[model samples]
Target chain A: FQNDAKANFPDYANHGCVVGRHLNFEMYQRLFGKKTAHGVTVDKVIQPSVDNFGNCIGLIAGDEESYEVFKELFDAVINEKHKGFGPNDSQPAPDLDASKLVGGQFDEKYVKSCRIRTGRGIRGLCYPPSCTRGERREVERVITTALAGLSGDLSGTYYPLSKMTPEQENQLIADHFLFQKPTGHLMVNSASVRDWPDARGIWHNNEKTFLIWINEEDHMRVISMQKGGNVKAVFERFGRGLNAIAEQMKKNGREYMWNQRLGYLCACPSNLGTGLRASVHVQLHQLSKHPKFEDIVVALQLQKRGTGGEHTAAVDDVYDISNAARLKKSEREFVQLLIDGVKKLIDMEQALEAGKSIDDLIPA
Target chain B: FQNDAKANFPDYANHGCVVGRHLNFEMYQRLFGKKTAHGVTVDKVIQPSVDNFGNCIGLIAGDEESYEVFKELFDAVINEKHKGFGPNDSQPAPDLDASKLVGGQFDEKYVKSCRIRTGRGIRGLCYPPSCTRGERREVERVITTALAGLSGDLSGTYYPLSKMTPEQENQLIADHFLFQKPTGHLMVNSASVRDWPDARGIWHNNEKTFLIWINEEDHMRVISMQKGGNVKAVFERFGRGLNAIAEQMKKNGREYMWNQRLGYLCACPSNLGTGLRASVHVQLHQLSKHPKFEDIVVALQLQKRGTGGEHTAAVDDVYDISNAARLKKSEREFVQLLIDGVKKLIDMEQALEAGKSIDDLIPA
Candidate 1:
């Protein structure tokens, strides 16, 4: 039954996938039951969709090899999600340095914390959903070994899930540092958590400003964070930390998964290129009161998440905002988009408070 | 030698075409000398490039029928210029009404004048470059009859080029109401002026706010203009007058050339689709002094022409600004882009004058 695509086809009938409402049983049947050379199948690729079908793309490549061996499926999902990206187009070379960044925090009075995170999957290994138990353990071992060599601001202590002390877990959870265990059917059905707590771990620098998640959704989730509106500093630190980890991995004869066309590879097609999410938590009290606030956010190419994060609701006037587009733009450009948009939002808020119009800010 | 492609190919060598520096003599050899069923050859199509090699596009469709018969070339040039527009993509149904337009004029302090113009070619006849003496006269006969029926504010007197009195000609010139005769090598080489002014004419309404040019580059060039920054009134008049003309032409059993993919067909590839240009003459004293002023105009998707028009130099800090893109957007959207961008530029100017930084107005 697990291998039978017909038995699993009904799961998408009532609930639509992230490709939207038109992805019916017919498309699922047409695209399903296919396999790549690495023993990856459509069933394994869409495992993450079972629990949260509402947010599912109905497709994901298990590993770097699957991307090429099963390019037909991957390209279909990639083109649909990214739009205008075709086989002929390739992502631009990433600008990881922060030297070109303009201005610092704009309106410290309204901005909260800024956090930027990017995912890097180790090459030659399967991603979380398609990765085997041994493969996942190897990923963690290699990353943690690389982490051990990190010094200066990036020096960190790695804690594997199986070895975490109770107090450490409590403290990490309270500080929102640790990712939650996969209990939802989305991960369970996908077998992403098949060997739960075995190799999965968290590593953080002494200052907790830099952190990495191992063997989670990606092989590595590198993050940089700080309070207030200084996104430039957070982005600079993120660029430095990511390059350092990649440098260490190179020494260990390991490399993050990358594609000329999609940049950094990941489990979700939406995170295909760069896999960068530069975000901020900010209060837009007056602008939020406008009827066109959501429309304005969309025009600026921003994603407005609940203060708690995606799939959650906002509390107070604080909202978590980030660059909505992950592909097409360079890594630094994505960071700058977040910085500029947040600044513009605060400007609009101030204008609204002064009874001035923001009609000019709206795109035609 | 005139019909020989190899002999004529060197025109692109010393001087680049609008397709840019990469458009070499080799490309000219390959694309030249090819003819459609309607006898539209590449040489005839690119005639307009001869005068100003600096501003040449190197390729154009002489008549609407040539687009399909020689689609391979048109699609190549179109794809390169319009970008993303291909054989499959189509222009949306035009929204000619102005009810959805937001905000009127913003900052009359610096705004001067607004003008909106569009072109329409009679369907069954060849465009100026390809049409013969008889065909051109027929086009004028039909269009003038249609204009004779106009009433109300739309009512206008048609003045044939051959019949214009000296006073009328001088007065029209003083008011900038008459288009100059084509004396440039671009038109002379293309045979666009083969019969001189025999069938060419200009029509203007009683209020002189609406005007039309006949037997020109395109079969018809409809224009609407006004002083000050009320672009909404100018655009609404443009839409209404265009529709009224089209309606009258329908009564005479004539229709404007149109394509589902390209919208209104023009002699110039750049003017395809809505063939619309919405512009304003405005002062930007302080902001234009900034090093990135031109870059800002480009980022806003605006064309900054000189005060006189395209190819002229700016005067008195007044730049004739308009939307640069013509295709892939509705007619109304083009007008809206002009309105929104001008308002933003003025906003930046004000902020700069107030000693406030406009760093946020810059795109990331």
Candidate 2:
């Protein structure tokens, strides 16, 4: 019977999927060459830790409607029923399985998990072996101090986590910021199994969600008034509550613990302090046909009073229109044209959202 | 009868020798490639003129200085009786009757019997065609103008030339300048040849000498200054004299008229108006062996008066130590050391010549 079951459910060992915090390995290499005496190399081994998920978790906070749209889009692209890789596959299985491996399970109290040794050992953080224990401790102390100062109540409003209903909060905690929303949804050749583990099962089950809030307090106030009163102001007050929670986590020493293990709080010229830029993934065919959709998305993102400053401190957004990945060459021209039109619309939307007259927004 | 005749007659055709001017054709090509609007190829051409032996001349300059050098050096190496062409065993008889071809003779009026087209067909100069016509004209004009202004005082100064006694002029020229002595000797070679159409049967001999002075100033200067100097001033005066002669020839409507040609000029930031720069060629090997020699050379180049203006302009110099033309990987390190020493001497020489104190010229 066990043999029969094994034959029927052939585990695709080589096949796997990973999701992580914003990391572009090639970009990292371009920015920094091999490690020098003064700079750190991104690819270095650190000591073993419990929050060793095969993949990292990414977090972003937006309106319920935007979050729902993201959820729909993500689910459409990623499903267990898919065969080769994702939603289109014939055989539905979890893209990754974390339970079978040794030292790979979520530890709730620490809000992390133990992971098996990966080729990218310890998230690839390296330092000099000759560094004394005291020196290492000092570095850790400085990092923690820097992070503690990042959170504060801006505009005296907006609790990021508290604005959500109890149901939404529970959902957020269970899904680890909604990353595992589609867990055990369906399988192609077998009945659906509930709560199938992600690649490492570590982050999928972890309770603590890594949250980084980038805001434009000054810019948001102007946007709030333009939106005809305090709707945006109310939304921001809720974001502040979330910021408060993050602050509390920092005071309790839990925040630094997560960041240290996960290699978080990366600052880059392109992304600035939060490094939480968003991008929308659309089918090239759809984008080509509805070029104005891109603009609409951009306008929506810009109109919302973000916590960051003018969105200049962070990269506003990105559009993935690569032909090799999704779009065909024949369709690319049309898609590009659509993208251009949408960008113009987005500009117009931003001007209107900022309380500019139509005449002011139009080019002379 | 033939043997008796041969015994009595010495071969006049085999008396003169051929010397060469080193020209790096590849360097010319590289320079042209960098600046030309439309690519142009250099071709060798002959300018009809007579030689010191009263022989009609045909000389060609091309992208092969090695070939030109080899023609002369090879004959010299083999101990050939004279600059003969072809294999020694089957060497062709000298064209003794072709007196118009043997250039380097000058008449009382210093008219050339033969001429050779070289460089860019600028009548007298022989540089690569890559040298712009406008640039050549500009250099020629500057030198001639400067000399014309100085004629009244310059004749009796250090290097008296026109109408001066040969001995007195030679001594003054040699004492005041470095390359002028060699040039004067070359001039003598031209002057010594008998005038053509004379009773002595010296066909067009005087024409060769005149051509050498009037039509080939650029080549003569190059040969004279391969080992550097303050000879630029002397060349400027010679250029002006040639221009005056050319004007006279034009009035006479002479077929063989002098043409103004480009010559070297030395200018430094300190000597913008009056470039009184001086230069000399120092042997790198000799300087390297004696550290104090390097110091003395530099101090001589850079000495300045108490008023902060140099007595002369910046004196630039060159060293032909280890021949940059024949670099080898194995000898590079040694050559580099020699080059460094040479550079040190150059700096010291400039400082000393500019009127800096000996103490100021020394390194800390």
Candidate 3:
């Protein structure tokens, strides 16, 4: 069961999940070379309440609507013993129905643009942090050869890091396309010398609407995005792109790292479920101007980043908003969470514009 | 009306209130260089619903037995609007009665030392950062003279910033006695003649149980502390010392800055309301080792300061925990929040110690 999650997100669990790494009893002793260090031993590591998600901090649901995969971890972390661990509170079991993931027709009056991105890793090979350059190259070769079979809007050519021109790099960045080369941290922890830089690249459709970042944090980071607030359209397209790629990989005799308990594992434990992050850039004009702006931000778990990038500042009234929970629910559920949170924010912003007394809007 | 809050809390508001700095519309424009800068103009500054505390976030009821003073602001910020904030959520409106305030006894098993310190500005002084040398000197003189009359365990003496020896300074800090000179950003956005090395010092009684930091951040900072977890004794004595000094200042015809709406105005807006931050350093033993330790830290707004000072790391299982919300509750209420949160933490620790199934304790 622990290996299920490990086998699923091996790549991200190695490198990107630095702070959120989990260690089970077997892994803890094997990695630390001790049954006990100071106080925590195998017994402590295997405590079901704490180690329900194996070594990870957050839980993950199994599929579209299964709460069992990560419920124990959720309840333990939430720690309100009397109160019920909420539906989708621990491992996400969102209310969203994937088969009919149609349009919510998300209100665009206040939304600037919507974005949804998911992360993935390859099967068979060890994840990057423990992977040899030759192994990474082989994985990369397999993905590119698989990409040769993808059709129509999903079909794309691979651009290796060593071969891309500076202008082309700028073009992708400007278009919000994802592509990057692995840095030095990907080298083996203790393995012998191996080739370097054989398999890192970027894959994008002719229209540049879809992209796969090869050999960066994960084995492959698949993304699909577009302008405006048509969430269902964007999400449907996102699912489509991922499905096409997964199918092509299957044709090449490859399978994505997957687990029965964790839907799709990623670098961080919190991203173990659907590994979906859907967000929108919005102009929260009135609400941001209210005296309780700071409180509202904290309450909604609304995050901000400059249109430029994370760690940058946004222009007036504009905000980068997303769902606060990533691991709590399924992909459909997670996107729906983001959708619902965004809708409420929009209503608040609109209410502010309508001159609703701040007091009443706040029910004070 | 804005001036009402100003006139009421002049000395303390200017010097001590560090986090709740709210400028009036005119002053705000002068500082920012425009009336409509960022769209918040005069109208926004005068909304009582928003600015009733006049920059301090809220009001704190002085004596406990009440939650009326800042309840509105607390609700708005802690925000239980659409749903709930929980039994232990937001600005703690603990049910602890303060009339007797003699016993909440505070479990000794978990609590190590209880330290309750509050910041106050002199009755007729400008707080530094925006203070003139003349205002600071007069305020310092007024406070020092008043300390002369506070005899018994509360009696103390003063030493100028420049007059202190290196060893004396070291002793004060080692004892966690607050006395220090200003620096850096304190000199920004001003007259530019910020060479303020005039009159600043420390005062302590023979027992060191009660001490005062003068002309550091505030014109006067009354601190009452002791080893062990006798919170009532420490807090009761703390109030006693402040009252004695206030009476002495009254005799000298100096009024401490105060406001009818907010308690003691401070520099920070978050420090408004009760203007009280009562904290206790406690041992968490098994609690800190729990799987949900990080979640617990955030859920309760618990803070940890190093044994040395704020913003430093703690040692082992010991932590300096304080009520996170200072603006939304009364002085008594704030202390109660700390006591209650710490008590719950201790219970969790004991549960872990019993090797109790984490499920029953945390509820799966």
Candidate 4:
């Protein structure tokens, strides 16, 4: 048992390995005998860390009890991964009042799309990283049933991954309305894809403005999007739509997996709080060419991805910019940060086009 | 009246004037005769902004009603001044449990002193910016009476500013334990100091670890500090001490002035939320010389001042580093950010000493 644990223990030498760097052999030894309420042990929780040598933050909580029972290991991983989240910290209550949100739209000519998404875990069930096949199916059943009840602009149909034809799947992918299957070490090692494509599915409205991915990295990924720069509209629809789904779930005697200390439960420690990523794709040809582009992004509390989303390079001038911070602030604040940040970036791009210095654009 | 209001309106060209930039002439014209529940019109609320050309965030709420009644002007000022704060946002509840805090001490040789302070205003009274002389005296009376009851480690003596001997005043200033009178237009124009020193004072414990400055920037500047980098200790003592003062004030039928939208109300909009400044004095000679020092500070959500505090330059490589953000996050989270950031910076300094690049240390 000791040898097995040692072999799988993440290498602390990996600077980006949050779990590997935080969970030393000593802490692992202390948590070996401990078992979460779901009967998961230290090995099950650390399986991803063992399997993925290149994983950034590899530890996963088997259930809510995993946080309570193995707090020492989990807390360290959470604090380091989330940066500002601490043992006593709590995420602000979700503020879905979008009437108060400003910055109605971005420069339509420069912005391609705007989207905001968040994940939810079911109460009294294991997280995706360690749930059984039956648990996964149960989550799918509950969510698909809830999707049928979404009306108005959120009305949609569920397309089970198991039944998805290649033609339909390709079309959805082409339209940027689908989330691809887990392939990387980070997702595959998580043990979440065990019975691949069995109960997994995507539910989307007719306009594809609202969508839900069930039994993915999380139990559900509630998303809202639209072409152009109307972030406030996207956010307002998102707020109303998520609540409608939550009300249905509540009728089924299920509730969201929430902790006072962590706000939202998720497979990845970085996404633990709020589980929100509000993003927009915009063309920044001049600013992106500047040397201090990355610095500007950091200063504005934003992260940039390529044209194709995560792990892709910007094919042209279009790049995906999103709020980098997930924890500490409220969901609404996250959206606001993204709105304000993208506006600032657009202004910087204009400044560069006019041959002006962007030193004043940087926040102190 | 129109001419008078226009004359008092902040100059929009003043880049540092938060009120000036947000509350334009049109906004002033729109808010002309709107009065708060306390009878303070738009002019009284913007007195400081009108008076101070150099004020960064120069708007003050005459009373809590000042927020609701003239919310248009106040909200615009708040959103711009506090940056991330929006109309719907709320600050996280205060987390005073220091037991969960780690990193008990810094390398004593380098860290000079650690301190954390927050301000609070009494309920049913106007904020300092618009308070009358009698109201100021009332606040001083309630606070000084409460100080007499603090016992055991927190027990302290109240020294009225009116009776403060020159020798004592000079000694306190020299010891870094005093706040000077409001001199700049920001404070003087607010009409908060109508009877300066008449109803202001300081209370300090025998050990001098805990102190409260009555009628300073806010109603009270409750502070805790100690020599060296025992941040947790200083924080724990501060938590216990502030609650004790609150309890004493409660006995006198006064509660803190708090709002659902904003946490703690202060004269300056920038200090709206947690009103916390957790800081430490540390010498970072090598890193301070690094070209990207300012960038690193911004990335870590920290702000740097000098040995003499705000508006001063770092003296002999010793800098006063504190959490730059005052809104959104909890007070505990601010302290944690400072602790974790300072530790990372020290590590970077060591890396620099070893002639290593610090690019990896910067967060993405």
Candidate 5:
């Protein structure tokens, strides 16, 4: 099982991958040399973390000139800021951090934070590379303050399988999020168990798992075990269980189950045949630094057959993961690659400029 | 005073005219074919009468081959069997015989008979014009037999005006023959005497009069007595009294009072203006038959100008009277002439058929 898993998942490095670095004082001096780089003046920039959903988030802003420079870069169009990058300066690099510092990571983090703090979640991120720290922080402060006020009284939250009102809870979720994915799955907030009358026995008991998914389409895909098994072994065993269940149900069919770690469960009702579809309003600077990302997403879809049902995989100015089955294997691979590449770029840039990576700073 | 009265009240034979005639055999035979005359065949002619507002009421069946013959003689058209008239050959002529029929006159004798015979008051009328004498007698016999077997209680026989609930009283009025006129004025059947409680006075003790005419423009005219006068006086001074009252109100600058009576009336807010307005639906059959008679109706308008205020009128086909008005001097004269002509026609027809004149019919 380990050998097969190793074969399936090969080791990859940042060989052809490009790293994105947030502009620092030295870098700014080297590039602009006191000439003010196309009259651009960034006001601020922000950096946030991903939630359980693996979405990075942040914000950025600047004056008119700086905004223009940032806009060109984020849109995958080379401009004054992208001049020294490559021949196709308009094309984005593979560096996740550079793209994230400008827009990408901020989008994921902002959306996740919004979902948690405010009942309403955000859809995307906004960070023009030239934007200053002050501008980004201001945005974060506004969103955080607004969301904090909204996360009021979560007493009514419950799991779908529990004897609770799923619709009411879902409504609360929708109200709290700015951009909400129509998830058929339910959620059990870890904090709600204490309020239960018989919570004593189940107190701090992870064993009392609350089932969230309601519909057949959003069936669970084992991500990782707390202990004992690897992803492949778990998937094989889970497949055997599914087959056995089907047999018991008097069905003469072999059913296969897929597994992924920290990845979206492709077969979901909201994602229905598609996955969780998301449209991100990313700043232009991030796109330019990751020009190949779009192609990568398209390529991944070509690799495997997604959960086949109604919807299909597609990408436009926005990302839509509605139909997991409809997505070709290549598309999934492409998306995974894009995500990994962008994350790595962000880490590398931080290390190069600050003499430490984000992991090092956070000390997981 | 007699001279003045003579000037105002024209001769019955010379000036008095029948606006419309309730055709007897001779008249019907002369007007329509003998075979088509009312009471001739199972399907023949129809009878005529005065509407609630004293409008000459007549109906011609469309199924009749000679409907045009009847229309040429009648002023207004109505459905056969409507307005208290049935097919000529159908029966005895549909007349509510107050003297003997059920739901007839609530006189002392009938009430006593009903109490000793039946426990309840009569339900509906079934006599004259619709049934033969033998048939009517048979109906009465059945009712008498039915009542004899009842409790024989007399308490339910007497319908006291004071004891009636508003709804009961309204229903009683609604079922009243004269008050349910096809045209002319609504003849209310109750009277309020200061000697009695609010609603306890003599109910249906007074007669309501309505005048009808046709102007030069071929519109109909209607006038009704205000609530407060006796029946004879109401009939006698219909046109004249209405003019006086209207003129007096107008002189007091109460033209708005006219608007109320034009259709219906509610009480005045401060009781300043008299809520009393007289109006009726008068049939113009006789007047319509003669152009000169029509001219007389137009003449009534001359009186309106003398009274003051603008008066307009129109005819509703559903009613027995052609809509008329006395908005101008010429129009008043026209109406007066019409009234006179109508009176004359009635006298002429009575003389021809009954061998009597208007004076003869009413003994002095």
Candidate 6:
């Protein structure tokens, strides 16, 4: 088993293969930084101690029980594949087509608004946690140069981290646009924020709509979004916008790492497939009251967020729910999964509202 | 003053416009719904009783004292304008060129995700509360046919309310996509589900990306969205998509109602100007703790949503903050306002985090 794992699996450093295989001081601290799950402090990602112990999700977001139950299938799946560091039982990446997305088409009564975004890396640059200041600047320059050609609504201004005023810098973060900065963890690691805000910049449309985060954790995180639940509009824009961006990147002598099986290369392996996280801001008032709400979350593979975002607790009853399995299904299927699960939850809530017993409705 | 108000102001149902004007049932009930503020019930959008009642903002979101303090100027601004029931001291719509948007060039730590959407109606078509089943079907037919011709990511499958299944319906709402449905208030009002889901349909792209809500509140609610903070992409998508849709409607021998001054006419006069609501989901932990958080919100012309939505309580300090001003300002200006206000809030929060004395930096 050990030989099978070491011989076939890839993305290795000094020894055995692992997901999130790339690392430096901050990525570990920031991405996999400190988090106490169930009162037990644990790193977000744990490298396998033995050759056969290949598991990423189990260690990142799961507990001991979750790891135990998932490890066997996880190991078995990788062993069966001869690909470079194939994930064992890992969810395959999704193929996204915004037209088929749910929110871009749902009724506003139940769903308020929706958004789907993913992370990507430049082919030649190392991941953010490990990239040098020069590499970061290169990333920013490549993306910024490429964005210059965009016109109409897609056209936007770019603000570098160093040149921005105090107001511009503050507003940028409050708006939830991702950026790159070596936090304490990044400082403790390497690159040490040495270039200190050199190559980092943000590009967005004049309307402040579509955007791309240059030199963030990944080289460029291309994004398309708006209000309401129209996923198609966002998706199509992304489709065209990304195509334009990639073409410009290529024109500007840039290449994003490509892989047949992985879809888009990212800093994290869990994001390897589609690297897309399609989500919606929804209220599960009735669903939240269900006795089995927590269990239902696991069954749905959903990520819930408080009003404050991924890290905060949900305010009121609104939750940012999306499919948690980025690697398991195709982008379309995963989004479908989210739509299906959210629909079911909403239905349960409606039923509960109507004073009916949904015990027969909810899956045990 | 009384005689001048009577001669100049209009929109008394017949003379004065009333699109989403605070209603006793729907608007007041759900719009104002239930929230504690100085022990009085107040809708989000309030109407002043007389001139010098410059109290839109305070009446809409504030209490008695709030209204008293701001009513004078609010009334004066509107009275100064000669348009039909001119809005008093209306906040101007922003000039939006997504390329020049805040995040496209932001530093990325303070901001979160940004979104912008607008509501519009066909000139002759009935509002959601007044449209008949046939009219609804007319809306559905015209929109679907036009949508079919959309190319690329903006194109996808169209699902009619008539043909959608239980599962399909569930997914649609859960996904935050736009669809036609009568709520309790709609039932209480004029259009009590008259057509009963006859004329409603939703069109989305293949990847579930872009979308358009047919036979919704207005004849059509065009949308574009995605994850991440990129308004430019969304704006461009909406710009092109909306233009395409308008052209298609024209090709199909349809015309949207428009006034020379009002970009897009609506039942609600407040939604004048560009009919755009540019917003972002952001965090303001330190800002929230400030002694003047409530005051800050008023100053910004912002709508703060709980993690659950616009109507719920905030969870974990994150807010669904957006431009509350739908008139006066152009789309770009509103976008700029959002960028500026959010920047200030973020800076305050960061300053607080750093243990610096920034009282001088805050707005009075």
**Per-candidate TM-score, chain A:** 0.90, 0.23, 0.70, 0.92, 0.22, 0.71
Docking class for candidate 4: incorrect
Top candidate by lDDT: 4
Each prediction's number of clashing residue pairs: 3, 88, 22, 0, 133, 122
What would the per-residue lDDT of candidate 4 be over residues A1-364, giving only the tens digit for each residue? 1124443343344345566666777887677667876677776676566535464566777777887888887888878777755677777877777877777688987888999999998777777666654566778888888778888878888888767889989988887667766766556545455545656898899988998889888888988999999999999999899889889988898888887777888767778778899999999989999898998899899999998889999978899999998888888888889888988999988998999998888776
The interface RMSD for candidate 3 is 34.4
TM-score (0 to 1) of chain B, per candidate?
0.90, 0.23, 0.70, 0.92, 0.21, 0.70
Model 4: residues with Cα > 4 Å off, grouped in runs: A1-364, B1-16
Q: Please give the distance, in angstroms, between residue A40's alpha carbon in candidate 6 and its true position after superposition.
A: 31
lDDT per residue for candidate 5 within A92-141, as digits (tens), equals 21111221222223324211110000001111212222222222223233
**TM-score for each model:** 0.47, 0.17, 0.39, 0.48, 0.17, 0.39
Q: Write the candidate numbers in order of decreasing lDDT.
A: 4, 1, 6, 3, 2, 5
Q: Tens-digit lDDT track for model 5 on B61-158?
A: 21122333454333222222122222231111211112221221122211111100001111121112222222223323333233223221111121
- Kindly report the TM-score of the first chain in candidate 4: 0.92
lDDT tens readout by residue for model 2, A246-345: 4644564433211211111221111111112221122222222343543454443322111232233212332331111111111112223323433444
Classified by CAPRI criteria, candidate 3 counts as incorrect
Number of colliding residue pairs in model 3: 22
- Over B197-224, each residue of candidate 6 has an lDDT whose tens digit, in order, gives 5567787887664777676556676666
Chain B TM-score of candidate 2 stands at: 0.23
Model 5 scores a TM of 0.17
Off by over 4 Å in 2: A1-364, B1-269, B301-364
User: Which tens-of-lDDT digit does each residue in A1-364 have in candidate 1?
Assistant: 0223344453343345653344456666776656665568654565445324365676666777777765755676788788667898899887887888887575678888889898998877777776654577778878988888889888889877777899999999987888866655445445465445557899999999998998777789988999988888998899888888789889878987887888888877778888888888899888887999899899889999899888898778889999998899998998888888888898888898889999987766
RMSD of each: 29.1, 35.6, 29.6, 28.9, 37.0, 32.4
Q: Which runs of model 1 end up more than 4 angstroms from their true locations?
A: A1-12, A18-34, A47-55, B1-364
Candidate 4 residue-wise lDDT at B154: 84
